[PDB]
Amino acid sequence: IPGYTYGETENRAPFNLEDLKLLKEAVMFTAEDEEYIQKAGEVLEDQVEEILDTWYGFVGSHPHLLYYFTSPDGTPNEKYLAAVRKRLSRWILDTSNRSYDQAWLDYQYEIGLRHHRTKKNQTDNVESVPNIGYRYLVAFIYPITATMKPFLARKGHTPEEVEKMYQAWFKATTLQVALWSYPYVKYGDF
Amino acid sequence: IPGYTYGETENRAPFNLEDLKLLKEAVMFTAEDEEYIQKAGEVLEDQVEEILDTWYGFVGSHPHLLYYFTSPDGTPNEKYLAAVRKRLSRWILDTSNRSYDQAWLDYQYEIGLRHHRTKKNQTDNVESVPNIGYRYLVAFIYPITATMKPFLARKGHTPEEVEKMYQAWFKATTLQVALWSYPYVKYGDF
Ligand code: HEM
Ligand code: HEM
Ligand SMILES: [C-]#N
Ligand SMILES: [C-]#N
Numbered sequence: 001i002p003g004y005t006y007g008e009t010e011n012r013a014p015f016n017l018e019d020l021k022l023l024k025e026a027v028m029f030t031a032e033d034e035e036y037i038q039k040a041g042e043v044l045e046d047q048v049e050e051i052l053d054t055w056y057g058f059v060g061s062h063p064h065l066l067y068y069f070t071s072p073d074g075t076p077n078e079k080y081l082a083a084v085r086k087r088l089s090r091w092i093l094d095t096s097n098r099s100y101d102q103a104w105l106d107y108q109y110e111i112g113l114r115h116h117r118t119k120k121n122q123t124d125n126v127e128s129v130p131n132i133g134y135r136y137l138v139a140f141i142y143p144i145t146a147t148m149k150p151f152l153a154r155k156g157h158t159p160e161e162v163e164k165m166y167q168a169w170f171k172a173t174t175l176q177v178a179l180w181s182y183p184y185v186k187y188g189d190f
Numbered sequence: 191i192p193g194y195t196y197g198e199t200e201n202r203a204p205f206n207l208e209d210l211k212l213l214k215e216a217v218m219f220t221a222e223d224e225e226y227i228q229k230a231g232e233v234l235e236d237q238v239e240e241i242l243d244t245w246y247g248f249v250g251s252h253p254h255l256l257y258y259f260t261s262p263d264g265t266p267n268e269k270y271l272a273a274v275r276k277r278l279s280r281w282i283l284d285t286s287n288r289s290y291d292q293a294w295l296d297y298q299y300e301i302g303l304r305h306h307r308t309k310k311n312q313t314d315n316v317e318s319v320p321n322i323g324y325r326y327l328v329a330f331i332y333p334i335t336a337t338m339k340p341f342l343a344r345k346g347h348t349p350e351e352v353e354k355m356y357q358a359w360f361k362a363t364t365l366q367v368a369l370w371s372y373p374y375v376k377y378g379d380f
Binding site for chain 1: 209212213215216217218252254255306307321323324325326328329330331332333335336357360361364365367368369371372374375376378379380
Protein backbone atom coordinates (compact mmCIF):
# COMPACT_ATOMS: atom_id res chain seq x y z
CA ILE A 1 0.00 0.00 0.00
CA PRO A 2 1.86 3.04 -1.30
CA GLY A 3 2.74 5.54 1.44
CA TYR A 4 1.64 3.23 4.28
CA THR A 5 4.65 3.39 6.55
CA TYR A 6 3.40 1.87 9.82
CA GLY A 7 6.45 0.48 11.67
CA GLU A 8 8.87 2.46 9.50
CA THR A 9 8.35 6.10 10.44
CA GLU A 10 11.36 8.45 10.63
CA ASN A 11 10.42 10.03 13.96
CA ARG A 12 9.74 8.71 17.47
CA ALA A 13 6.36 10.14 18.60
CA PRO A 14 6.57 12.94 21.25
CA PHE A 15 4.18 10.89 23.40
CA ASN A 16 4.82 7.47 25.05
CA LEU A 17 2.93 4.51 26.62
CA GLU A 18 2.46 6.48 29.82
CA ASP A 19 0.80 9.37 27.94
CA LEU A 20 -1.32 6.70 26.22
CA LYS A 21 -2.42 5.04 29.51
CA LEU A 22 -3.56 8.40 30.88
CA LEU A 23 -5.40 9.29 27.67
CA LYS A 24 -7.22 5.93 27.48
CA GLU A 25 -8.44 6.72 30.99
CA ALA A 26 -9.85 10.09 29.95
CA VAL A 27 -11.75 8.38 27.13
CA MET A 28 -12.91 5.53 29.48
CA PHE A 29 -11.15 2.92 27.37
CA THR A 30 -10.46 -0.44 29.04
CA ALA A 31 -9.61 -4.08 28.28
CA GLU A 32 -13.38 -4.55 27.56
CA ASP A 33 -13.14 -2.08 24.66
CA GLU A 34 -9.97 -3.78 23.33
CA GLU A 35 -12.05 -6.99 23.06
CA TYR A 36 -14.90 -5.11 21.34
CA ILE A 37 -12.73 -3.02 19.02
CA GLN A 38 -11.26 -6.35 17.85
CA LYS A 39 -14.74 -7.85 17.38
CA ALA A 40 -15.71 -4.69 15.43
CA GLY A 41 -12.84 -5.29 12.97
CA GLU A 42 -14.26 -8.76 12.37
CA VAL A 43 -17.68 -7.30 11.45
CA LEU A 44 -16.29 -4.40 9.35
CA GLU A 45 -13.51 -6.29 7.46
CA ASP A 46 -15.90 -7.67 4.78
CA GLN A 47 -17.66 -4.38 4.35
CA VAL A 48 -14.68 -2.04 3.95
CA GLU A 49 -15.43 -1.07 0.31
CA GLU A 50 -18.98 0.11 1.11
CA ILE A 51 -17.76 1.98 4.21
CA LEU A 52 -15.20 3.94 2.20
CA ASP A 53 -17.86 4.83 -0.46
CA THR A 54 -20.13 6.08 2.37
CA TRP A 55 -17.30 7.97 4.02
CA TYR A 56 -16.28 9.61 0.72
CA GLY A 57 -19.90 10.31 -0.27
CA PHE A 58 -20.09 12.41 2.94
CA VAL A 59 -16.81 14.20 2.30
CA GLY A 60 -17.54 14.90 -1.38
CA SER A 61 -21.06 16.11 -0.67
CA HIS A 62 -19.72 19.29 1.02
CA PRO A 63 -17.49 21.64 -1.02
CA HIS A 64 -15.66 23.03 2.07
CA LEU A 65 -14.64 19.43 2.97
CA LEU A 66 -13.91 17.94 -0.52
CA TYR A 67 -11.72 21.11 -0.68
CA TYR A 68 -8.91 19.34 1.26
CA PHE A 69 -8.55 16.79 -1.57
CA THR A 70 -8.59 19.37 -4.42
CA SER A 71 -5.95 20.55 -6.87
CA PRO A 72 -5.24 24.27 -6.87
CA ASP A 73 -7.99 24.75 -9.56
CA GLY A 74 -10.68 23.67 -7.04
CA THR A 75 -11.31 20.30 -8.67
CA PRO A 76 -10.75 16.97 -6.86
CA ASN A 77 -7.40 15.26 -7.38
CA GLU A 78 -8.65 11.75 -8.13
CA LYS A 79 -5.14 10.38 -7.67
CA TYR A 80 -4.95 11.88 -4.14
CA LEU A 81 -8.37 10.47 -3.10
CA ALA A 82 -7.49 6.98 -4.41
CA ALA A 83 -4.10 6.79 -2.65
CA VAL A 84 -5.51 8.09 0.66
CA ARG A 85 -8.50 5.72 0.45
CA LYS A 86 -6.18 2.71 0.56
CA ARG A 87 -4.47 3.99 3.69
CA LEU A 88 -7.90 4.76 5.29
CA SER A 89 -8.88 1.09 4.69
CA ARG A 90 -5.70 0.06 6.53
CA TRP A 91 -6.56 2.34 9.46
CA ILE A 92 -9.94 0.57 9.93
CA LEU A 93 -8.10 -2.74 10.38
CA ASP A 94 -5.22 -1.24 12.38
CA THR A 95 -7.62 0.37 14.85
CA SER A 96 -9.27 -3.04 15.32
CA ASN A 97 -6.10 -5.27 15.40
CA ARG A 98 -2.87 -3.51 16.38
CA SER A 99 -1.52 -3.50 19.90
CA TYR A 100 -1.61 0.19 20.75
CA ASP A 101 2.12 0.19 21.62
CA GLN A 102 5.07 2.51 20.70
CA ALA A 103 4.89 1.65 16.97
CA TRP A 104 1.14 2.40 17.03
CA LEU A 105 1.86 5.80 18.70
CA ASP A 106 4.64 6.50 16.19
CA TYR A 107 2.16 6.01 13.39
CA GLN A 108 -0.46 8.23 15.17
CA TYR A 109 2.07 11.07 15.22
CA GLU A 110 2.68 10.46 11.49
CA ILE A 111 -1.03 10.53 10.58
CA GLY A 112 -1.40 13.79 12.53
CA LEU A 113 1.61 15.24 10.69
CA ARG A 114 -0.08 14.26 7.40
CA HIS A 115 -3.38 16.13 7.98
CA HIS A 116 -1.30 19.13 9.27
CA ARG A 117 0.87 21.39 7.01
CA THR A 118 4.05 19.60 8.26
CA LYS A 119 3.57 16.65 5.85
CA LYS A 120 0.28 17.09 3.97
CA ASN A 121 0.64 16.35 0.20
CA GLN A 122 4.16 14.82 0.65
CA THR A 123 3.19 11.15 0.92
CA ASP A 124 1.42 11.19 -2.42
CA ASN A 125 3.55 13.94 -4.08
CA VAL A 126 0.46 16.00 -4.95
CA GLU A 127 -0.24 19.73 -5.14
CA SER A 128 -3.23 20.36 -2.86
CA VAL A 129 -4.33 22.66 -0.05
CA PRO A 130 -1.43 23.17 2.48
CA ASN A 131 -3.25 22.37 5.80
CA ILE A 132 -6.49 20.73 7.01
CA GLY A 133 -7.94 23.21 9.58
CA TYR A 134 -7.91 21.41 12.93
CA ARG A 135 -11.46 22.48 13.73
CA TYR A 136 -12.53 19.79 11.17
CA LEU A 137 -10.48 16.90 12.58
CA VAL A 138 -12.37 17.30 15.89
CA ALA A 139 -15.66 17.71 14.04
CA PHE A 140 -15.01 14.49 12.10
CA ILE A 141 -15.12 12.31 15.19
CA TYR A 142 -18.89 12.46 14.91
CA PRO A 143 -19.41 11.48 11.22
CA ILE A 144 -16.67 8.76 11.48
CA THR A 145 -18.73 7.14 14.27
CA ALA A 146 -22.13 7.65 12.53
CA THR A 147 -20.84 6.13 9.32
CA MET A 148 -19.55 3.00 11.18
CA LYS A 149 -22.77 2.43 13.12
CA PRO A 150 -25.14 0.85 10.56
CA PHE A 151 -22.31 -1.35 9.25
CA LEU A 152 -21.73 -2.77 12.77
CA ALA A 153 -25.35 -4.00 12.83
CA ARG A 154 -25.27 -5.56 9.34
CA LYS A 155 -24.11 -9.05 10.46
CA GLY A 156 -27.17 -9.58 12.73
CA HIS A 157 -25.25 -9.01 15.98
CA THR A 158 -27.58 -8.13 18.85
CA PRO A 159 -28.10 -4.35 19.48
CA GLU A 160 -26.16 -4.72 22.79
CA GLU A 161 -23.12 -6.22 21.09
CA VAL A 162 -23.54 -3.56 18.39
CA GLU A 163 -23.71 -0.83 21.09
CA LYS A 164 -20.51 -2.06 22.72
CA MET A 165 -18.70 -2.14 19.34
CA TYR A 166 -19.87 1.38 18.50
CA GLN A 167 -18.86 2.75 21.91
CA ALA A 168 -15.42 1.14 21.48
CA TRP A 169 -15.08 2.79 18.01
CA PHE A 170 -16.22 6.17 19.40
CA LYS A 171 -13.60 5.92 22.19
CA ALA A 172 -10.77 4.71 19.88
CA THR A 173 -11.54 7.45 17.30
CA THR A 174 -11.66 10.16 20.00
CA LEU A 175 -8.39 8.84 21.39
CA GLN A 176 -6.69 9.04 17.95
CA VAL A 177 -7.86 12.48 17.00
CA ALA A 178 -6.57 13.73 20.40
CA LEU A 179 -3.07 12.40 19.56
CA TRP A 180 -3.26 13.91 16.06
CA SER A 181 -3.71 17.42 17.54
CA TYR A 182 0.00 17.39 18.51
CA PRO A 183 1.54 19.17 15.46
CA TYR A 184 -1.45 21.65 15.46
CA VAL A 185 -1.19 22.70 19.17
CA LYS A 186 1.14 25.47 20.54
CA TYR A 187 4.21 23.84 22.09
CA GLY A 188 3.61 23.19 25.78
CA ASP A 189 -0.21 23.39 25.38
CA PHE A 190 -0.89 19.72 24.44
CA ILE B 191 -23.75 33.03 38.83
CA PRO B 192 -20.30 34.42 39.61
CA GLY B 193 -18.03 34.56 36.56
CA TYR B 194 -20.80 33.64 34.09
CA THR B 195 -20.39 36.33 31.49
CA TYR B 196 -22.47 35.07 28.54
CA GLY B 197 -23.51 38.14 26.50
CA GLU B 198 -20.90 40.35 28.18
CA THR B 199 -17.54 39.08 26.96
CA GLU B 200 -14.75 41.57 26.20
CA ASN B 201 -13.75 40.05 22.86
CA ARG B 202 -15.56 39.28 19.60
CA ALA B 203 -14.87 35.61 18.73
CA PRO B 204 -12.40 35.04 15.82
CA PHE B 205 -15.07 32.87 14.17
CA ASN B 206 -18.49 33.98 12.79
CA LEU B 207 -21.89 32.52 11.74
CA GLU B 208 -20.41 31.38 8.44
CA ASP B 209 -17.66 29.41 10.21
CA LEU B 210 -20.44 27.99 12.41
CA LYS B 211 -22.63 26.91 9.45
CA LEU B 212 -19.70 25.04 7.90
CA LEU B 213 -18.77 23.38 11.20
CA LYS B 214 -22.36 22.24 11.92
CA GLU B 215 -22.20 20.57 8.51
CA ALA B 216 -19.02 18.67 9.38
CA VAL B 217 -20.70 17.39 12.55
CA MET B 218 -23.96 16.56 10.63
CA PHE B 219 -25.96 18.97 12.77
CA THR B 220 -29.32 20.10 11.35
CA ALA B 221 -32.65 21.67 12.36
CA GLU B 222 -33.68 18.14 13.55
CA ASP B 223 -30.89 18.20 16.15
CA GLU B 224 -31.86 21.74 17.27
CA GLU B 225 -35.32 20.32 18.08
CA TYR B 226 -33.78 17.35 19.93
CA ILE B 227 -31.09 19.31 21.77
CA GLN B 228 -33.96 21.47 23.08
CA LYS B 229 -35.97 18.39 24.09
CA ALA B 230 -32.82 17.05 25.83
CA GLY B 231 -32.64 20.20 27.98
CA GLU B 232 -36.20 19.50 29.08
CA VAL B 233 -35.26 15.98 30.24
CA LEU B 234 -31.95 17.01 31.88
CA GLU B 235 -33.10 20.26 33.61
CA ASP B 236 -34.55 18.43 36.66
CA GLN B 237 -31.59 16.15 36.97
CA VAL B 238 -28.74 18.66 36.81
CA GLU B 239 -27.50 18.11 40.40
CA GLU B 240 -27.05 14.33 39.90
CA ILE B 241 -25.36 14.89 36.51
CA LEU B 242 -22.78 17.23 38.02
CA ASP B 243 -22.06 14.71 40.87
CA THR B 244 -21.56 11.99 38.21
CA TRP B 245 -19.40 14.26 36.08
CA TYR B 246 -17.24 15.26 39.06
CA GLY B 247 -17.07 11.70 40.39
CA PHE B 248 -15.42 10.82 37.04
CA VAL B 249 -13.03 13.76 37.13
CA GLY B 250 -12.05 13.26 40.77
CA SER B 251 -11.56 9.53 40.36
CA HIS B 252 -8.40 10.10 38.23
CA PRO B 253 -5.48 12.04 39.77
CA HIS B 254 -4.16 13.27 36.37
CA LEU B 255 -7.62 14.85 35.71
CA LEU B 256 -8.55 16.17 39.22
CA TYR B 257 -5.05 17.75 38.82
CA TYR B 258 -6.52 20.64 36.75
CA PHE B 259 -8.62 21.73 39.75
CA THR B 260 -5.78 21.49 42.32
CA SER B 261 -3.88 24.09 44.33
CA PRO B 262 -0.13 24.10 43.90
CA ASP B 263 0.18 21.58 46.83
CA GLY B 264 -1.63 18.91 44.74
CA THR B 265 -4.85 19.07 46.75
CA PRO B 266 -8.22 20.05 45.21
CA ASN B 267 -9.26 23.69 45.51
CA GLU B 268 -12.82 23.19 46.74
CA LYS B 269 -13.61 26.83 46.01
CA TYR B 270 -12.51 26.40 42.35
CA LEU B 271 -14.60 23.22 41.85
CA ALA B 272 -17.71 24.84 43.38
CA ALA B 273 -17.51 28.03 41.27
CA VAL B 274 -16.87 26.10 38.03
CA ARG B 275 -19.68 23.62 38.81
CA LYS B 276 -22.23 26.44 38.73
CA ARG B 277 -21.05 27.57 35.31
CA LEU B 278 -21.07 23.92 34.04
CA SER B 279 -24.75 23.69 35.11
CA ARG B 280 -25.43 26.81 33.02
CA TRP B 281 -23.69 25.28 30.00
CA ILE B 282 -26.05 22.25 30.10
CA LEU B 283 -29.03 24.61 29.76
CA ASP B 284 -27.29 26.96 27.31
CA THR B 285 -26.41 24.09 24.99
CA SER B 286 -30.09 23.06 25.04
CA ASN B 287 -31.73 26.56 24.81
CA ARG B 288 -29.56 29.30 23.30
CA SER B 289 -29.73 30.28 19.66
CA TYR B 290 -26.23 29.43 18.47
CA ASP B 291 -25.69 33.00 17.19
CA GLN B 292 -22.80 35.55 17.54
CA ALA B 293 -23.24 35.88 21.32
CA TRP B 294 -23.17 32.08 21.63
CA LEU B 295 -19.91 32.00 19.56
CA ASP B 296 -18.45 34.83 21.66
CA TYR B 297 -19.04 32.75 24.76
CA GLN B 298 -17.53 29.62 23.09
CA TYR B 299 -14.31 31.57 22.48
CA GLU B 300 -14.38 32.63 26.15
CA ILE B 301 -14.84 29.07 27.48
CA GLY B 302 -11.94 27.93 25.28
CA LEU B 303 -9.80 30.78 26.61
CA ARG B 304 -10.67 29.62 30.15
CA HIS B 305 -9.47 25.99 29.77
CA HIS B 306 -6.33 27.35 27.98
CA ARG B 307 -3.48 29.28 29.75
CA THR B 308 -4.83 32.60 28.32
CA LYS B 309 -7.52 32.90 31.03
CA LYS B 310 -7.44 29.78 33.23
CA ASN B 311 -7.67 30.63 36.98
CA GLN B 312 -8.61 34.32 36.28
CA THR B 313 -12.40 34.01 36.49
CA ASP B 314 -12.28 32.60 39.98
CA ASN B 315 -9.03 34.33 41.12
CA VAL B 316 -7.45 31.02 42.14
CA GLU B 317 -3.90 29.66 42.05
CA SER B 318 -4.06 26.40 40.07
CA VAL B 319 -2.32 24.64 37.20
CA PRO B 320 -1.62 27.13 34.32
CA ASN B 321 -3.09 25.18 31.32
CA ILE B 322 -5.39 22.20 30.65
CA GLY B 323 -3.51 20.08 28.04
CA TYR B 324 -5.66 20.11 24.90
CA ARG B 325 -5.32 16.37 24.41
CA TYR B 326 -7.84 16.06 27.32
CA LEU B 327 -10.47 18.47 25.97
CA VAL B 328 -10.78 16.23 22.87
CA ALA B 329 -10.74 13.11 25.05
CA PHE B 330 -13.56 14.53 27.20
CA ILE B 331 -16.06 14.52 24.37
CA TYR B 332 -16.54 10.84 25.06
CA PRO B 333 -17.16 10.86 28.86
CA ILE B 334 -19.38 14.01 28.55
CA THR B 335 -21.64 12.03 26.19
CA ALA B 336 -21.53 8.77 28.25
CA THR B 337 -22.42 10.62 31.42
CA MET B 338 -25.48 12.28 29.73
CA LYS B 339 -26.82 9.05 28.23
CA PRO B 340 -28.47 7.27 31.19
CA PHE B 341 -29.99 10.57 32.37
CA LEU B 342 -31.68 11.06 28.96
CA ALA B 343 -33.51 7.74 29.43
CA ARG B 344 -34.63 8.44 33.03
CA LYS B 345 -37.97 10.10 32.12
CA GLY B 346 -39.28 6.99 30.28
CA HIS B 347 -38.76 8.45 26.79
CA THR B 348 -38.63 5.74 24.14
CA PRO B 349 -35.09 4.47 23.21
CA GLU B 350 -35.50 6.12 19.75
CA GLU B 351 -36.25 9.54 21.23
CA VAL B 352 -33.41 8.90 23.69
CA GLU B 353 -31.08 7.97 20.78
CA LYS B 354 -31.92 11.16 18.92
CA MET B 355 -31.30 13.28 22.06
CA TYR B 356 -27.96 11.57 22.69
CA GLN B 357 -26.84 11.97 19.06
CA ALA B 358 -27.76 15.68 19.25
CA TRP B 359 -25.70 16.04 22.48
CA PHE B 360 -22.75 14.18 20.91
CA LYS B 361 -22.85 16.51 17.88
CA ALA B 362 -23.28 19.72 19.96
CA THR B 363 -20.44 18.72 22.33
CA THR B 364 -18.12 17.84 19.42
CA LEU B 365 -19.01 21.14 17.80
CA GLN B 366 -18.13 23.11 20.98
CA VAL B 367 -14.85 21.42 21.73
CA ALA B 368 -13.80 22.12 18.10
CA LEU B 369 -14.40 25.88 18.65
CA TRP B 370 -12.56 25.74 21.99
CA SER B 371 -9.37 24.52 20.24
CA TYR B 372 -8.87 28.06 18.85
CA PRO B 373 -6.51 29.53 21.52
CA TYR B 374 -4.60 26.15 21.63
CA VAL B 375 -3.96 25.86 17.83
CA LYS B 376 -1.00 27.49 15.95
CA TYR B 377 -2.24 30.65 14.22
CA GLY B 378 -3.41 29.83 10.69
CA ASP B 379 -3.83 26.09 11.51
CA PHE B 380 -7.42 26.19 12.87
C1 HEM C 1 -12.11 11.60 12.79
C2 HEM C 1 -11.24 12.30 12.05
C3 HEM C 1 -10.41 11.71 10.89
C4 HEM C 1 -10.05 10.42 10.69
C5 HEM C 1 -10.45 9.24 11.60
C6 HEM C 1 -9.24 10.36 9.48
C7 HEM C 1 -8.61 9.27 8.86
C8 HEM C 1 -7.57 9.35 7.92
C9 HEM C 1 -6.58 8.33 7.63
C10 HEM C 1 -6.53 6.97 8.34
C11 HEM C 1 -5.74 8.83 6.66
C12 HEM C 1 -4.54 8.12 6.00
C13 HEM C 1 -3.39 8.03 7.00
C14 HEM C 1 -2.14 7.44 6.39
O1 HEM C 1 -1.41 8.14 5.61
O2 HEM C 1 -1.83 6.25 6.73
C15 HEM C 1 -6.19 10.17 6.31
C16 HEM C 1 -5.61 11.08 5.41
C17 HEM C 1 -6.18 12.23 4.88
N1 HEM C 1 -7.40 12.76 5.26
FE1 HEM C 1 -8.30 12.20 7.17
N2 HEM C 1 -9.15 11.65 9.01
C18 HEM C 1 -9.84 12.51 9.82
C19 HEM C 1 -9.97 13.89 9.60
C20 HEM C 1 -9.97 14.47 8.32
C21 HEM C 1 -10.60 15.70 7.87
C22 HEM C 1 -11.42 16.68 8.73
C23 HEM C 1 -10.36 15.86 6.56
C24 HEM C 1 -10.83 17.03 5.67
C25 HEM C 1 -11.54 16.74 4.58
C26 HEM C 1 -9.54 14.75 6.10
C27 HEM C 1 -9.03 14.54 4.81
C28 HEM C 1 -7.80 13.87 4.54
C29 HEM C 1 -6.72 14.14 3.58
C30 HEM C 1 -6.60 15.25 2.53
C31 HEM C 1 -5.68 13.05 3.79
C32 HEM C 1 -4.36 12.92 3.05
C33 HEM C 1 -3.35 13.73 3.84
C34 HEM C 1 -2.04 13.74 3.09
O3 HEM C 1 -1.94 14.46 2.04
O4 HEM C 1 -1.12 13.00 3.57
N3 HEM C 1 -9.34 13.94 7.22
N4 HEM C 1 -7.26 10.43 7.10
C1 HEM D 1 -15.97 17.82 26.46
C2 HEM D 1 -15.05 18.61 27.02
C3 HEM D 1 -15.35 19.65 28.14
C4 HEM D 1 -16.52 20.26 28.41
C5 HEM D 1 -17.85 20.00 27.67
C6 HEM D 1 -16.30 21.18 29.52
C7 HEM D 1 -17.19 22.05 30.16
C8 HEM D 1 -16.82 23.15 30.96
C9 HEM D 1 -17.61 24.33 31.24
C10 HEM D 1 -19.02 24.56 30.66
C11 HEM D 1 -16.87 25.15 32.05
C12 HEM D 1 -17.28 26.52 32.63
C13 HEM D 1 -17.28 27.56 31.52
C14 HEM D 1 -17.58 28.96 32.04
O1 HEM D 1 -16.68 29.61 32.66
O2 HEM D 1 -18.72 29.45 31.79
C15 HEM D 1 -15.59 24.50 32.33
C16 HEM D 1 -14.51 24.98 33.05
C17 HEM D 1 -13.42 24.27 33.54
N1 HEM D 1 -13.15 22.94 33.25
FE1 HEM D 1 -14.08 21.98 31.52
N2 HEM D 1 -14.97 21.08 29.85
C18 HEM D 1 -14.34 20.16 29.04
C19 HEM D 1 -12.99 19.80 29.14
C20 HEM D 1 -12.28 19.82 30.36
C21 HEM D 1 -11.12 19.02 30.76
C22 HEM D 1 -10.41 17.96 29.90
C23 HEM D 1 -10.78 19.35 32.01
C24 HEM D 1 -9.62 18.76 32.83
C25 HEM D 1 -9.89 18.22 34.02
C26 HEM D 1 -11.68 20.40 32.47
C27 HEM D 1 -11.64 21.07 33.71
C28 HEM D 1 -12.05 22.41 33.90
C29 HEM D 1 -11.49 23.51 34.70
C30 HEM D 1 -10.27 23.53 35.62
C31 HEM D 1 -12.40 24.71 34.48
C32 HEM D 1 -12.21 26.10 35.08
C33 HEM D 1 -11.34 26.86 34.10
C34 HEM D 1 -11.02 28.21 34.69
O3 HEM D 1 -10.17 28.28 35.65
O4 HEM D 1 -11.64 29.21 34.18
N3 HEM D 1 -12.56 20.64 31.42
N4 HEM D 1 -15.62 23.33 31.64
C1 LIG E 1 -9.95 11.32 6.25
N1 LIG E 1 -10.90 11.00 5.78
C1 LIG F 1 -15.12 20.61 32.70
N1 LIG F 1 -15.53 19.79 33.31
